[PDB]
Amino acid sequence: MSIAEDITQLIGRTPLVRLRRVTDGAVADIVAKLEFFNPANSVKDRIGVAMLQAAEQAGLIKPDTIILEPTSGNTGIALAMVCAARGYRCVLTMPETMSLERRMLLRAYGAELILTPGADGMSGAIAKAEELAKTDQRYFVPQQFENPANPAIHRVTTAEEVWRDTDGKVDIVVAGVGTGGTITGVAQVIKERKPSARFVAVEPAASPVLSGGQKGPHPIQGIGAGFVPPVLDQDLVDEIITVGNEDALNVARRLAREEGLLVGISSGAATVAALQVARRPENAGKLIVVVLPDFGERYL
Amino acid sequence: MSIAEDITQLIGRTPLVRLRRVTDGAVADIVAKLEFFNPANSVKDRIGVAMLQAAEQAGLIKPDTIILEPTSGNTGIALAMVCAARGYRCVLTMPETMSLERRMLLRAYGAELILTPGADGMSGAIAKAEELAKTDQRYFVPQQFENPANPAIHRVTTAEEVWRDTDGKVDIVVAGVGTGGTITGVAQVIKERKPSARFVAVEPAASPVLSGGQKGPHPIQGIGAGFVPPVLDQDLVDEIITVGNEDALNVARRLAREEGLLVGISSGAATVAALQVARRPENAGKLIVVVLPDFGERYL
Ligand SMILES: CN1C(=O)/C(=C/c2ccccc2OCC(=O)O)S/C1=N\c1cccc(C(=O)O)c1
Ligand SMILES: CN1C(=O)/C(=C/c2ccccc2OCC(=O)O)S/C1=N\c1cccc(C(=O)O)c1
Ligand SMILES: *Cc1c(COP(=O)(O)O)cnc(C)c1O
Numbered sequence: 221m222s223i224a225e226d227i228t229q230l231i232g233r234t235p236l237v238r239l240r241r242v243t244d245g246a247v248a249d250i251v252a253k254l255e256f257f258n259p260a261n262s263v264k265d266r267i268g269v270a271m272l273q274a275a276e277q278a279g280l281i282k283p284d285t286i287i288l289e290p291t292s293g294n295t296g297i298a299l300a301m302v303c304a305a306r307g308y309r310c311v312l313t314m315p316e317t318m319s320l321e322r323r324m325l326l327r328a329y330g331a332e333l334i335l336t337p338g339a340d341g342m343s344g345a346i347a348k349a350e351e352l353a354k355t356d357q358r359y360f361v362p363q364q365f366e367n368p369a370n371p372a373i374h375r376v377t378t379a380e381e382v383w384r385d386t387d388g389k390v391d392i393v394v395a396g397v398g399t400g401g402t403i404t405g406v407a408q409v410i411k412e413r414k415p416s417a418r419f420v421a422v423e424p425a426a427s428p429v430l431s432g433g434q435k436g437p438h439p440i441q442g443i444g445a446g447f448v449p450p451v452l453d454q455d456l457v458d459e460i461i462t463v464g465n466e467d468a469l470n471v472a473r474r475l476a477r478e479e480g481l482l483v484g485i486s487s488g489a490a491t492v493a494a495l496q497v498a499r500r501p502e503n504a505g506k507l508i509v510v511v512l513p514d515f516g517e518r519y520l
Numbered sequence: 521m522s523i524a525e526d527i528t529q530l531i532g533r534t535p536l537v538r539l540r541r542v543t544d545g546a547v548a549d550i551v552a553k554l555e556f557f558n559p560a561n562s563v564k565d566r567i568g569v570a571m572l573q574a575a576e577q578a579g580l581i582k583p584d585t586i587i588l589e590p591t592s593g594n595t596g597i598a599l600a601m602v603c604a605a606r607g608y609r610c611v612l613t614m615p616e617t618m619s620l621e622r623r624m625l626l627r628a629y630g631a632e633l634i635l636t637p638g639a640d641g642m643s644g645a646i647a648k649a650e651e652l653a654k655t656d657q658r659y660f661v662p663q664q665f666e667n668p669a670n671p672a673i674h675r676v677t678t679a680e681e682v683w684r685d686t687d688g689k690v691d692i693v694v695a696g697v698g699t700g701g702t703i704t705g706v707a708q709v710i711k712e713r714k715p716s717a718r719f720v721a722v723e724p725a726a727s728p729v730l731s732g733g734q735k736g737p738h739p740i741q742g743i744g745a746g747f748v749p750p751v752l753d754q755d756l757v758d759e760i761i762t763v764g765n766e767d768a769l770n771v772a773r774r775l776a777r778e779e780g781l782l783v784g785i786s787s788g789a790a791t792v793a794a795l796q797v798a799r800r801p802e803n804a805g806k807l808i809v810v811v812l813p814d815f816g817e818r819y820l
């Protein structure tokens with residue numbers, strides 16, 4: 221019998237698809253890992269479950285614990301879904317600038333939202349979470365940017381899925397860096413097993429922090445956090461490619477129209493970079509795996 | 521190597537999950553088949569690909585063919601996605617009442633929309649498609665309510681997935697009837713292989729046509745078509761349960777909040793009916809498979 225006990229057991233195990241049309245000038249094979257196949261349509265499902273599992277296994281969840289995280293992204297949606305399956309109480313802080321669509325989605329999962337001043341943005345959401353946690357001991361805050369379970373779940377699931385589905389033939393992995401968990405976990409496993417493997421981090425040209433530049437605003441949701449996340453292991457990253465907003469959006473649109481892959485803007489970004497790498501003659505005949513983090517419908 | 525050639529090869533093979541909390545008074549086991557795991561988040565992905573495959577295999581697609589279908593539902597989204605993967609031109613007719621969100625989603629896949637008068641509703645969308653097809657021979661119209669490939673793909677995929685994942689232990693399948701393809705295809709295979717198996721069709725109390733009542737408006741998108749669809753085989757249906765709008769919506773909300781299963785209203789409907797059947801003492805210890813047709817996010 222193959223029946224999951226709950227929805228969190230159906231997280232991960234996402235498929236690879238070969239790009240057929242969005243391949244201009246490529247001399248390498250480009251295959252895309254479709255993180256939108258996760259139950260709530262993003263890669264963050266993996267760290268939502270994993271950060272809570274790790275807390276559970278370490279005895280950090282008490283009968284009165286409340287899950288708390290400042291998030292304006294997919295991690296909130298994943299945490300809300302995972303808390304609803306677990307029967308945990310979930311509080312999320314975010315700027316009051318968040319769309320009503322997003323709020324309704326979080327509340328549909330039974331999450332409670334604390335809206336913080338629009339002008340303070342993310343830092344205000346963090347300050348509010350910091351203060352709530354400091355003054356009420358019931359709160360457990362997963363801390364997606366620091367939590368070792370983020371890269372760990374990618375070592376154990378994402379990486380092995382890439383390894384097995386490519387029969388060890390993957391040569392290059394291309395991934396947008398938000399928390400850095402995905403590329404770090406995959407590199408940690410794959411680079412040791414196959415030392416010739418290479419890893420390309422993608423960030424916005426508009427906020428080129430890993431390249432050595434300065435934080436700036438940008439629309440590529442999920443990547444370009446504006447600082448070097450502690451979870452990221454830069455020594456495993458072989459190259460950084462910056463991607464402009466317009467190219468990221470153009471390639472995302474091409475993915476939907478030409479491959480039937482309706483993906484988010486950060487998937488467009490990662491694909492820009494995978495196309496770039498794929499054009500290099502030294503990469504003729506190589507297999508490039510590109511991570512597509514989420515579904516595009518959420519962005520319309 | 522496990523790499524799909526395109527997105528249409530990743531349709532189907534959706535998982536079963538056991539309901540844990542939305543089970544009040546049940547004496548039977550209730551497991552849910554999560555059709556939202558399909559690439560465009562609904563069961564209709566299966567018939568989008570299948571109706572086009574059948575046309576291809578029967579030589580009905582010509583170099584200048586244009587796909588045309590009147591649809592205000594998930595079949596449009598599936599057809600748009602499948603046409604985008606295939607590189608076919610896709611035209612959909614629908615009432616101008618359709619939300620801008622829906623239109624943007626269809627156009628994101630490169631589909632072309634013909635908006636018909638709001639007052640004529642579905643019949644106007646059908647009349648427009650009828651007339652375009654009649655006067656331009658390039659149009660191929662899949663005809664989801666009549667196309668034998670609709671129940672066929674359910675015989676070949678959905679049914680076998682239910683059979684294998686339950687190790688032949690499924691006793692009762694509960695499914696909302698829209699086109700009727702799902703319940704028909706599953707019954708056709710399962711009832712012959714296990715003649716004690718039973719099948720429950722679900723329709724809206726607000727439009728109880730299969731029960732012998734009259735068409736009326738209702739919000740349970742995907743079911744209650746308002747007539748007996750030709751594709752449906754009523755002789756395989758063992759019982760009809762009607763479901764009220766409020767119960768359908770209440771159970772859908774409970775699924776999201778209590779199981780982390782964010783599903784559409786018709787999934788709430790099917791679950792109402794599965795809970796009802798599950799309370800009958802004669803069903804103690806039986807395995808009930810309930811089809812959950814789509815993701816809830818599209819409804820917010
Ligand atoms: C644009 N942006 C930011 O500005 C962020 C700031 C942030 C978020 C969490 C912790 C620290 C933080 O930065 C303070 C610093 O500069 O050290 S996080 C961010 N984007 C992301 C990237 C990935 C996930 C998320 C999320 O909110 O779930 C947000
Ligand atoms: C509420 N409703 C209707 O009223 C429909 C009418 C219809 C749709 C297609 C063909 C015939 C039709 O009816 C005319 C008749 O009464 O014989 S179809 C419908 N709902 C559904 C159910 C399942 C799928 C779809 C869809 O538009 O993709 C629509
Ligand atoms: C989280 C996220 C990323 C980056 O993944 P990390 O493992 O955090 O580096 C990219 N895109 C989107 C849409 C995300 O939600």
Ligand SMILES: *Cc1c(COP(=O)(O)O)cnc(C)c1O
Binds near residue numbers: 562698703786
């Ligand atoms: C199509 C559909 C159904 C019914 O499935 P059929 O196989 O057409 O009977 C139920 N709910 C939703 C949301 C649908 O799109």
